[PDB]
């Protein structure tokens, strides 16, 4: 379905007064500092040595390009010494880069700590997806995980968006950030909140909190729009995965460098020198996203008059 | 035509913190208590022994599933001893369940009392449908019926919806509830108020009054939306009737149990433990329903910010 | 689609016939019927409800004088209670044509029992390989049909449910002893565009077996579809849907009215075509176009003969 | 549709004709007409209003020199007042061709009276079985037409209203004595896709009766449709709609202008085709495509002859 | 539409040709051209502006080595100033092929003067009956062309503007003395669906006159349309639009680049088809479908020969 | 499109076959395969990743018993590291059929080295003129193939990537020594509607070389497309997409499940058609319609034989 980003139009800047070389795309995720506003979301894969090499290549490219790498689920690697090697390799090959651990919301605090130590993670992603998994204690388990692990915890919603009330609960539980991954199955055909509306809604209530948008971002323009809506960083999988399988590490690195240059180009045209400036770039929200936000009490005009 | 329910989108709840087994779907219709928020609307049928057996089977399934049964029109059974047997059977086969009598708005207070006694009814449905019947004294006749019968009276509008002014008049006349059954014929091609708009409109003026939605509800999601818009109970015919004719009583019972479990599933995902909670579930109204309600002075944002 | 929309009768300007002269009687093999339309009952959900529906359908069929094909009798063979729901059809309709109904897995003994259960005048054996493969084992179907035809004392109608029937299949069935064929008109995606339309099947089969009995049932929307199926060679047509709907809505009286209405609508069409009898309707000039025309042309079936006759 | 959009004239690059040399005179049987287009009046609502409309149409027809076919004279036969509304046509147009008009239920006596009422040069007998069956009894229509043709003293034109005419129907009518046929181009749903288009009827009939008179009326939108109908074999074409509209909007002067304009537009088309006379237009090379082409091919009518002539 | 989208070349998997071996030279009657594409200049608005445009087109044509057909010289015949805008074409392009241009109303004296004005190698005479009838008098056009062909000292190309050309028209023109025909591809509504497409005209004419020169101009969008027209039998093709656009946008340099590019794109298509010369492209196997296929089939033109050659 | 949607199997009502009797073994020239479907691996991005993907595909192919065609070995010929990614296929699958793969620019020495690298049972030589002309030099391709066939010790399969193959091209390849042909199904705009569909290529080639080996790969969406390609004459079919997707998503176990599933789905289709063996499926009656039917008719390929067989 749609991310809602097509309902966003930046206000054209005629005199950006900026050179492409002055553009700084460094950003922050909670207390972490990243040289890139885009990170790689690896897939869990089918395991075996193939997943091992895919992870090793993703880690090598991430290390060379200087972008963060979020591994696929470590739930099975926690009890499988062999699969564990396919995660440890990421840190061995990328000793100085940002790497995010990954477990589901069912994980215990002890599992969370183990997943973080396995790859010397700088952050931990915890995934939520009630709709697909169809409960009680989920928030409490997340609170304990945030308490027990020292690194920032990023709670990710898969496929249905996230409301401001849900983000508020996660932030109160201790989450450093939320990641909007924007016969019974029919009930959810038109269910959820789009990525664009989720970002605007959450930002209206928690202006200084960290939000990440992942999944569904097709190109640098979508990345730019998610950042303008409030995201501090964005995740991408498919495009990078395809580049790796089709052109190897060299191809993936090229694709990574490409999208980063395209984002800087867009920022240049908008006269946005830094990520902070892009997060304040004037834009107009229309269509379904506009209607949703208006009914939800979120001010849309402030995006256009800022 | 459309019920308008597609113009309703629940706000996704990421952390419902609820187990399917904690969900309570019991509700109330005026002073009556029902273990189910869904009831069966029988059709008048062609009479004869076929209607007798259909009614007997509907009554048996209703009794076993614990859901209420509203019989088809009793107008002809009032003067036909033979057809009378096809209604008396419902109470004989379902001694302890909720059964609703049914007559048209032309019925007299004496007919109303007779229809109620015929099946030991717990409530009486009185149907309105001026558009199809093309008058004076209709409301007065309904007032007398409400005065003369002790059981709660449910006034049902067939096909064109019901405005808040119309519901107000019915409540003042003594009705315990309203049921939104959402060359001259051409004039009414785009006539009426949708089920969604009727429910929202009536609820805005009579927040504590009983409303029922019947007809046009396709599945548990529609049932959930009508309840969120204010309905205390919902009626269904077609789907149950088809199940009976195609798979007998056992099939009907299965279909009944199925839709109830699907409603609980939706409630679970929304974090709504009870019907009262579902009636307060945050949602966004859009499209034609939104426009209609806005012009009619009904606050739509309160549904989204609640 | 049935493919009948690809059929267009050649307009007759001087039909020279009064509605009152129209005779719609027909023959199904050696069986004589006063109506070219019969009722296809559904198996239903069993119980007293199916019993009353079957009783009403039998009553209506008896009064309207049209044939009645019951739903599958497979379960009634071992269920005493369900059996009563089929026997009632013959008790309520002692003089009308009634067709028994079993699947191709039936044995000759089961076939005789189904016929005896309702004093049947003919027996339908249904074939539905594709539907069964989706929901296995098709070996012996023709053998079973052959054993059935030589052992029952009534004509056997072999019915294809949903995917049409080729002239080769019809030939194997007639050769095996069938008195007539009835064109009922994930892994399931494989069969989305599978099959032969009712219109193409009738034309194909008739081209090879001009004197053989064919029936079309399923998908016939109104009297015009009935007229077209007969013009393509069918001796009788079956309908279920709107007949059962009329019953549940307006009872026996409604069903009877609906049956009388479609029969009068057919006579009206025949009047406009100048077709005084079913035999004349079976020779009414018409033009075949579209998908049906292409299909028959590729299969070697002459289409222009329908238009020049 | 008339099916005329399925007809495409073969472009002539060197027509070698000046508009002034174009002759649009034609013949309808033994009748000679200076125009290949005639006015089809409507029966109207009676009273003095229909009288004045008929008078104006007769005036315009007389001045433009084109034929006039009156509306149904059935009621005027027994209504003295209505009769005046038809007699006025001949009083106002003493020298032009005027066609009388009755339905197929008419007797020979009624036919003679209708002809005498307006000093008619020909008589139209309308056939509309389908429309009458919707709104019964069609036996004897051909017999009545046969009795009429042998007893009236003028040529009879048998007109099919709305569903086209087959070559078999035309043959029965010519055999009965008709001088020409005129292709007028719930239970009612049965006839939504019923009939033969004007284009297919003209081609079918002409293939069997190359020397017989055919007329096309109804549905002709402009001079190009007129040209096409003639190229398919029609000797004359009729129009009602826009002529009556021009009358009510701009009176007699407007009607006269509209008639002169379409006649000049036809001459223009003939000029571009290099067709100096109606007989040449009737042999103008053209290609038939689509539904019309398929229909004629299935019916055994040669279509390529139109393109190679 | 030109109908060229109804043409599909049969893919050759082993063309066995290097782009460098491709020869695109062709012949137009006895005239030899190094290019199968020529420039069709427009008459323009006169004045010094048309003069410079013509000078630039002549310069580009001379350098690229392709033929140039000037705009209508009718007014330049009596206007001394306009005449300079045509003479400049031969001064600027002394060795290239240049075609003169007049309408079919031209006399033999005017034709000789137009040829002499630019030292023309051939003369185009345009026919546009329909466009002139909309905006009269077509008698004598063939006579004038016949007088012109026997009196000018160069080959005459008769061009049909917009409605295509039939094989009968082409035969009359060749019989009259034309060296080639050029298929240029209210009352105006009559001609909305009028004519023969470029593709059908080429195929029709070639079927009757296999050895005769045909040219296609107008409507050719790119090198693929050019390749297709040649495969259908054209010896040369003309283009105006994008060439004039390239001139006004990027001057002479741009026009020259655009001409070189389309010629290389044609060689590319020929390379993939294994067609080493224009003569080979004229025999390249292809399949004709759709409206064009139907048209030719009805007109008796063999279409399968194109696919089996 | 592959054109396979233009193919419709004639429904068999009495298949008389149990799924267990279905034999899907086939032959590719002298090579015997237990499966009519093989895996087409992609060249990949090299490195250890391509190595593991190739190892997994070889493992799955060995266990499922189906053939494996590797990606282009051109670079592995000079790159020692890449070479290991191909040798691993034979180490992991010692007994299965494996096809080597090089482009048409390959020499006989390179062909022998590619075969030896993986102990290949056959060698694929790919032809893709159009794709190379977009991204030059095609002379000598047939000569190179001819040199390769006489010097390698295994059968050579010549594959056309994307634009289909004509019967003339196939004849040149078989004449040159190829054991089979494989139908892989700005200036780039010229080829938007270019080519012969997979369905038309198979039918064309089979009409001229009934006993020759054809393979179809690319564009086959599911088991029904596989069944259709075989019915049109293919002995084996190749797939890449969903197999590689299953591997990356669910590893070797997932790939193996996906292969087993499509093979069972094919057996299901064959069961419903009454086709007990691949040879029977290759003779299954079917009707060809649409674009494919038109193409073959124009090319002189009999289409009705498929429907009457």
The DSSP-derived string for chain D is: --SGGGEEEPP-S-----GGG-B--EEETTEEES-SEEEE---TT-HHHHHHHHHHHHHHHHHHT--EE----TGGGT-HHHHHHHHHHHHH-SSS-EEEEEETT--HHHHHHHHHHHT-SEEEEEE-HHHHHH----TTHHHHHHHHHHHSSS-EEEEE-SS---HHHHHHHHHHT-SEEEE---GGGGGTT-S--HHHHHHHHHHH-TTSEEEEESS--SHHHHHHHHHTT-SEEEE-HHHHHHHHHHHHHHHHHHHHHHHHHHHHHHHHHT--BHHHHTT--EEE-HHHHHHHHHTT--SHHHHH-
Q: Are strands F26-28 and F31-33 parallel, antiparallel or unpaired?
A: antiparallel
Name the residue range of residue E257's domain: 1-309
> In this structure, are residues B256 and B248 in contact, taking their beta carbons and an 8 Å threshold?
no
Report whether C72 belongs to an annotated binding site. Answer: yes
Report whether A237 belongs to an annotated binding site. Answer: yes
For residue A87, the SS3 value is helix
Report whether E218 belongs to an annotated binding site. Answer: yes
Chains that touch C (3 or more CB pairs under 8 A): B, D, F
CA dist A244 and F208 (Å) reads 44
Shortest alpha-carbon distance between residue F22 and chain A (Å): 32
Cα–Cα nearest to F68, from F38, F92, F42, F88:
F38
Residues of chain E with Cβ-Cβ distance to D18 below 8 Å are 136-139
Cα–Cα nearest to D169, from C10, C18, C14:
C14
CA dist E64 and E259 (Å) reads 7
Cα–Cα nearest to B177, from B216, B197, B151, B200:
B151
Which token pair is E143? 């006579």
How many domains does chain B contain in total? 1
Cα–Cα nearest to C44, from C75, C87, C80:
C75
> In this structure, are residues C298 and C291 in contact, taking their beta carbons and an 8 Å threshold?
no
**Is B15 buried (19+), middle (13-18) or exposed (0-12) by CB count in 10 A?**
buried
CA dist A89 and E141 (Å) reads 88
Cα–Cα nearest to D277, from D242, D243, D230, D238:
D230
Contacts within 8 Å (CB) and 24+ apart, B296-304: B296/B164, B296/B197, B296/B201, B298/B200, B298/B201, B298/B204, B299/B204, B300/A295, B300/B200, B301/A294, B301/A295, B301/A296, B301/A297, B303/A295, B303/B200, B303/B228, B304/A295, B304/A296, B304/A297, B304/B11
**Is A295 buried (19+), middle (13-18) or exposed (0-12) by CB count in 10 A?**
buried
> In this structure, are residues D193 and C4 in contact, taking their beta carbons and an 8 Å threshold?
no
Cα–Cα nearest to F129, from F176, F78, F169:
F169
CA dist F261 and C110 (Å) reads 37
For residue E185, the SS3 value is coil
| Closest Cβ–Cβ partner in A135, A157, A295 for B285 | A295
For residue A227, the domain's CATH number is 3.20.20.70
* Side-chain-facing half-sphere of E22: CA atoms under 13 Å: 27
Residues of chain E with Cβ-Cβ distance to F140 below 8 Å are 16
Cross-chain residue pair B53–C56, CB shorter than 8 Å: no
Is chain C in touch with chain F: ≥3 Cβ pairs within 8 A? yes
Report whether E292 belongs to an annotated binding site. Answer: no
Q: What is the DSSP letter of F189?
A: G
Cross-chain residue pair E12–F295, CB shorter than 8 Å: no
Task: Name the residue with tokens 């969900």.
Answer: B23
Residues of chain B with Cβ-Cβ distance to A294 below 8 Å are 301
Shortest alpha-carbon distance between residue C91 and chain B (Å): 17
| Closest Cβ–Cβ partner in B18, B258, B300 for A295 | B300
Q: ∠E238-E240-E244 over CA atoms, to 5°?
A: 145
> In this structure, are residues C165 and F13 in contact, taking their beta carbons and an 8 Å threshold?
yes
Q: What is the DSSP letter of B118?
A: H
Q: How would you classify residue A154: left for phi > 0, otherwise alpha for psi between -120 and 50, otherwise beta?
A: beta
CA distances from F273 to C192, C242, F267, F282 (A): 15, 34, 10, 11
Cα–Cα nearest to C44, from D174, B245, F291:
B245
Report whether A120 belongs to an annotated binding site. Answer: no
Residues 6+ apart with CB under 8 A from A116: A101, A124, A149, A151
Report whether A279 belongs to an annotated binding site. Answer: no
Chains B, C: CB contacts within 8 A come to: 60
Residues of chain F with Cβ-Cβ distance to C193 below 8 Å are 5, 8
Report whether B294 belongs to an annotated binding site. Answer: no
Containing H/E element for F173? helix F167-176
Is chain F in touch with chain A: ≥3 Cβ pairs within 8 A? yes
CA dist C27 and E196 (Å) reads 55
Chain E residues bordering chain F (beta-carbon distance below 8 Å): 5, 8-19, 21, 222-224, 265, 268-269, 271-272, 285, 287-289, 293, 303-304, 306-308
Residues of chain C with Cβ-Cβ distance to D190 below 8 Å are 222-224, 265, 268-269
Chains that touch E (3 or more CB pairs under 8 A): D, F
The distance of Cα A122 from the centroid of its chain, to the nearest Å, equals 15
CA dist F34 and F236 (Å) reads 10
Shortest alpha-carbon distance between residue E43 and chain D (Å): 23
Q: What is the signed CA dihedral for D28, D32, D36, D37, rounded to 10 degrees? A: -90
Shortest alpha-carbon distance between residue E139 and chain D (Å): 4
Task: Name the residue with tokens 């690229």.
Answer: E64
Shortest alpha-carbon distance between residue D201 and chain C (Å): 10
Chain D residues bordering chain E (beta-carbon distance below 8 Å): 5, 8-19, 21, 222-224, 265, 268-269, 271-272, 285, 287-289, 293, 303-304, 306-308
Residues of chain F with Cβ-Cβ distance to A238 below 8 Å are none
The distance of Cα F5 from the centroid of its chain, to the nearest Å, equals 19
Which residue out of D138, D140, D162, D297 would a mutagenesis test of the C interface target, given it has the greatest number of C Cβ atoms within 10 Å?
D138
CA distances from D47 to C191, D73, D84, D85, D119 (A): 66, 14, 10, 8, 22
| Closest Cβ–Cβ partner in F129, F187, F295 for E265 | F187
Which token pair is C109? 């003994």
For residue C244, the SS3 value is helix
Cα–Cα nearest to E299, from E219, E176, E199:
E199
Report whether C195 belongs to an annotated binding site. Answer: no
For residue B164, the SS3 value is helix
Which token pair is C133? 């493969």
Cα–Cα nearest to D7, from D289, D271, D299, D270:
D289
Chain E residues bordering chain D (beta-carbon distance below 8 Å): 127, 129-130, 133, 136-142, 160, 163-166, 168-169, 172-173, 187, 189-190, 193-196, 291, 294-295, 298-300
Cross-chain residue pair A128–B269, CB shorter than 8 Å: no
For residue C55, what is the nearest residue in chain B, using CA coordinates?
Answer: B50
Q: Per 3-state DSSP, what percentage of chain E is helix, strand, and coil (rounded to 5)?
A: 50, 15, 35
Report whether A216 belongs to an annotated binding site. Answer: yes
**What is the widest separation between alpha-carbon atoms in chain D?**
58
């Amino acid at each position: 379905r749609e991310t809602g980003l097509d309902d966003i139009t930046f206000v054209h800047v005629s005199l950006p007064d900026l050179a492409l070389e002055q553009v700084d795309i460094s950003t922050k995720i909670g207390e972490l500092s990243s040289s890139s506003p885009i990170f790689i979301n690896a897939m869990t894969g089918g395991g075996g040595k193939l997943t091992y090499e895919i992870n090793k290549s993703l880690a090598r490219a991430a290390s060379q390009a200087g972008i963060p790498l979020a591994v696929g689920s470590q739930m099975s690697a926690l009890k499988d010494p062999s699969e564990r090697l396919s995660y440890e390799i990421v840190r061995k090959e990328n000793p100085n880069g940002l790497i995010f651990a990954n477990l589901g919301s069912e994980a215990t605090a002890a599992q969370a700590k183990e997943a973080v130590e396995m790859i010397g993670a700088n952050a931990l992603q915890i995934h939520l997806n009630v709709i697909q998994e169809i409960f009680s204690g989920a928030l409490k388990r997340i609170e304990q995980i945030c308490s027990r692990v020292s690194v920032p915890v990023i709670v990710k919603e898969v496929g249905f968006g996230m409301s401001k009330a849900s983000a508020g609960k996660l932030y109160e539980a201790g989450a450093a950030a939320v990641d909007i991954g924007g016969r019974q199955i029919s009930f959810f055909n038109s269910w959820g909140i789009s990525t664009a509306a989720s970002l605007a809604e959450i930002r209206s209530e928690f202006p200084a909190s960290t939000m990440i948008a992942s999944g569904g971002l097709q190109d640098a323009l979508d990345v730019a729009k998610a950042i303008a809506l409030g995201a501090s960083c964005t995740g991408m999988a498919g495009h990078f995965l395809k580049a790796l399988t089709d052109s190897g590490e060299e191809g993936l690195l090229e694709e990574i460098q490409l999208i980063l240059e395209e984002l800087k180009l867009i920022m240049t045209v908008l006269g946005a020198r830094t990520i902070a400036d892009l997060q304040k770039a004037p834009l107009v929200i229309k269509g379904e996203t506009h209607h949703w936000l208006t009914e939800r009490g979120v001010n849309t005009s402030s995006y256009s008059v800022r």
